[PDB]
């Protein structure tokens, strides 16, 4: 069922989309990994919405941001985000 695929989607992607509710549209990417790590950002609009919760140093939020705007390959971003979330452990 739709819930069954969604379970395999999150269970194996260790990535969940948590929209921020309040008054402005916001997307919070959450990585399911004990330390619980997440970054706030969206491909829609952009505002002071700047929150980062990795588990090592700001360099992650830095290289991760420069990576998406510099590579233009959203694949190298989620792919490097995974390898980066691991290095934090």
């Amino acid at each position: 069922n739709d819930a069954a695929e969604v379970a395999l989607y999150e269970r194996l992607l260790q990535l969940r989309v948590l929209p921020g509710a309040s008054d402005v549209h916001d997307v919070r990417f959450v990585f399911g990994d004990d330390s619980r790590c997440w970054i706030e950002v969206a491909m829609h609009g952009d505002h002071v919405i700047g929150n980062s919760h990795p588990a090592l140093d700001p360099k992650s939020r830095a290289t991760l941001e420069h990576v998406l705007t510099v590579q233009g390959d959203l694949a190298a971003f989620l792919v490097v985000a995974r390898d980066m979330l691991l290095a934090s452990l």
Partner: protein, 58 residues
């Protein structure tokens, strides 16, 4: 509803999950063409997913 947005994300990574046979389908953007991976307990299914996903990045 937003289900299409989530599938659009994983689909953007070049992954095409399919429960029509408990298997994950895949597409290699660089060189290669299409690839398939069956779901199995194996030793570390989590590592297998990080394997195709690391290669999909290329």
């Amino acid at each position: 509803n937003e289900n299409i947005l989530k599938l659009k994300l994983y689909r953007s990574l070049g992954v095409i999950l399919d429960l029509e046979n408990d298997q994950v389908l895949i597409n290699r953007k660089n060189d290669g063409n299409i690839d398939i991976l069956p779901l199995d307990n194996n030793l570390s299914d989590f590592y297998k997913t990080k394997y195709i996903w690391e290669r999909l990045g290329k």
